[PDB]
Design a protein that fits this description.
The complex is a heterodimer of chains A (about 90) and B (about 50).
Chain A (H helix, E strand, L loop, with lengths): L11 H15 L11 H20 L3 H26 L1
Helix pairs in contact in A: 1-2, 1-3, 2-3
Chain B lengths: L8 H13 L19 H10 L2
The chains are: A mainly alpha (about 90), B mainly alpha (about 50).
């Protein structure tokens, strides 16, 4: 990873929180304890790869947040409409 | 970020509230009826999770 001055403007808390949402979107968790299930290692792995990718892709944490909020957005509605009304 | 569809404010505001305003919230759930509905979604998910 290259040294981007903006990464000092984003702490683990914010990013790990966004990682958490990535999981909450991909996996409509019934209970916060399903976020510590065996599927979690996999979802959080996906979320970390995803988060890290966009973290490195952006030039501001807000941008990285934005573009990630975009992919998570579409993922949410994708799963919702597919499973609900297109089938 | 992308917003081809400009109606992203719902999701952006959600994040703004949870992540920024509330700051910490790494324990949240709300899947009424369960959370294993992904099903077909898991297929593309396998595709996405496979490679970094």
């Amino acid at each position: 990873g290259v040294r981007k001055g903006w990464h000092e403007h984003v702490t683990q808390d914010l990013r790990s929180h966004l990682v958490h949402k990535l999981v909450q979107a991909i996996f409509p968790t019934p209970d916060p304890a399903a976020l510590k299930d065996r599927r979690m290692e996999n979802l959080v792995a996906y979320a970390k790869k995803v988060e890290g990718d966009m973290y490195e892709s952006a030039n501001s944490r807000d941008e990285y947040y934005h573009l990630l909020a975009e992919k998570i957005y579409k993922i949410q509605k994708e799963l919702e409409e597919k499973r609900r009304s297109r089938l | 970020g992308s917003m081809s569809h400009y109606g992203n404010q719902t999701l952006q505001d959600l994040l703004t509230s949870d992540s920024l305003s509330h700051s910490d919230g790494g324990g949240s759930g709300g899947g009424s009826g369960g959370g294993s509905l992904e099903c077909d979604m898991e297929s593309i998910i396998r595709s996405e999770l496979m490679d970094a």
